[model samples]
Target: HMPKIWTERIFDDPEIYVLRIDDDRIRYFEAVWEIPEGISYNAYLVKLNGANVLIDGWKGNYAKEFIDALSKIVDPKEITHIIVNHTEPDDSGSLPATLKTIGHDVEIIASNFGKRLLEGFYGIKDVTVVKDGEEREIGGKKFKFVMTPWLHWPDTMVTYLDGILFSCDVGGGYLLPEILDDSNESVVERYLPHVTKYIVTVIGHYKNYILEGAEKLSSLKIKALLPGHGLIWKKDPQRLLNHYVSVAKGDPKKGKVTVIYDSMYGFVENVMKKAIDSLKEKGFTPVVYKFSDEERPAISEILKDIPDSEALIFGVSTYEAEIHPLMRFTLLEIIDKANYEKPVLVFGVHGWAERTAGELLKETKFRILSFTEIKGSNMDERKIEEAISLLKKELE
Candidate 1:
């Protein structure tokens, strides 16, 4: 039997006994303009002593669901307060529509920064501004604002209620539906890397602030964490706290080395395989992946841990006497963002032209130990010996 709380998952209706929070899943442009797996916009509805408070709002596309859900929970007039944790549209996209639906008498609460962002975006006025460390009491519940500048945004602040932390995006990660059941050791370990990715790419710059905020949060005796983006942590908050702490401390871990190549007619792939074999011979383990066969996002995910890699190799097959299109795209992505300070090697098969390998090598910042050009797909003993010799020299 599903609990009454599950009813809030639906998009339409007007009722007051239960407060409804919406999770609007939308596409993010930062992740290579791809639709993120489970990214969501979280909005919460709460009942204080005698007033109804709506915390945050979903994106514009969710206007219907947001209005329908609120209508089922309470009359637009009964909602006395609307709180904006962050002014970003993902968190406040329905502000105008919600204001219009709920009437003009409602009070809007937000930080000074949030106010400016809202005013600039929507030109709304007369917002009640709350500074960092300020407290507002409504319906016998205390909402304490803790301003976290630059965690992800300059205006982001969290509202703490007893044991519940209304975190906008801090300390959040992607989670599968089943992992929400328990916070045991295995589950924590399984989710730690995902959390690390979130921290590194999303909030990597604010490590010191996160550490300070974590210490403050730990003292508050929080039992549950409700982040605006992903899974809710209700069982044991320490597991998440520890995970963030480890990521903040810059912990080192082993990761796979990927060799990507664009082979026009299998000649370049043959050389790539031989290079991979040579890597293995020197007690180094690596994975051979082809750009044409594997998904780019999956490759990007693997490259996130390239700082721990021994080396990365890009093999190319010439086309129109220039770099292969697939190889060029892959290298552009890797060179732009990858933090791989390790050695990189370039090798490939060419016909009638020998300048393609040199052209590819000029575009990267990796320390090129050597560049080998093999004619056709045939493996010459001397060529193989030269490539292996370079690998052995780099490994030593």
Candidate 2:
């Protein structure tokens, strides 16, 4: 599978160009999360009057392709400097190949932590460490560096040039958009959901850092956002920042409840169906995903729905005297990735009684409103209704 490549001039004043490579072949991101829609790795090149600066690089697998793409914009020998915003291999994997292509002593600029990672991942030691909020004059233009540590990594930082912010992963998302920039309304509306998924799966473990990073960046006038992945935000950059803040804060949508379950032999599904109906009767919008014999929902997609949900409901079947393996993994991932302060209602259906699910959830950040047990065919419809009511009252 060949990845599509795009190299286009985005800005004229600074002669900025974008080098994007869409990875349609990737079925899983970071070798865990399922991303069937695929993702794109974006690297940018800035051409000042006298200096050529390269920002980030592609994955190591794409090294040859990245070099070919870079050569289309400017000669590798002409690149005077390289900027390493985050030393994550996804964005820094091609650095060794790139330096080899340059064939000269070129200055590398990075955060102090970024320098350490560069030496560890790659044996390169020559790096100019920029302090937090440090501004340097390069190519007759002012470039400001702001440290956004733990924005997926401690080495993370963003470079601000003029009114544009080179935010590597802070504003990044998944998917390969049809257009280069956020110029089309239709494209953006479709891509934001993927952005939410990317946030939860990749950076959700350090989400508080996203909030701190946003607060740190609020002082800058961001006219355009050039990220290392997905679409660039040039139309309305503030909207993107606001989205990140909202996700970081776990802002809920009105009456939006997420229902997730795994049904072996349709027992758990039967219970969730009643729960879902009760949710609908109460004027709540229930977004449902299930794991049945015929279907298995993406855990990434399930995680994406959590931040904007007013509440969560999980239905699982007891298997081999324990929580179903799939449901167990899903719950652990939810607790790890999307552990919000929102209320939750769990329904357990089993041939035998097992309180493991409730016991496991008690230690999480989620507030368990109730855990109803359904034994075989003896389903209690009233209990499901009461759980829904309790959820509604709690939310109210």
State the C-alpha lDDT per candidate: 0.65, 0.91
* Candidate 2 residue lDDT tens string, 1-396: 589999999998778999999998889999999998888888999999779999999988999999999998899999999999999988999999999999999999999999999999999999999999999888999999999999898899999999889988989999999999999999999999999999999989888899999999999988899998899999999989899989988999999999988887877777788889999999999999999999989899999999999999988888887988989999999888887898998888654545887777777788988889866666767888999999999988
- TM agreement with the true structure for every prediction: 0.70, 0.97
Best by lDDT: 2
TM-score of predicted model 1? 0.70
Model 1, residue 271: distance off in Å is: 3.4
Candidate 2 regions exceeding 4 Å error are 350-353
Clashes per model (N, Cα, C within 3 A): 9, 0
* Tens-digit per-residue lDDT, 1-396, candidate 1: 211112243111111122223332434424442324444556677765688888887677777777876777678778899888778887788888999897768888888888899899998887998887888887776778888776767878887877677777776664333333235667666665566656655665466667877876766777667666555676876777777776665443443356777765667777777777776776666766676544444543543444345677777777776777777666665554443346767776565554654554465446777777756735674675576567557656
Q: Residue 353 error for model 1, in Å?
A: 12
Pairs with steric clashes in candidate 1: 13-71, 13-72, 14-71, 14-72, 14-73, 15-72, 15-73, 16-73, 49-139
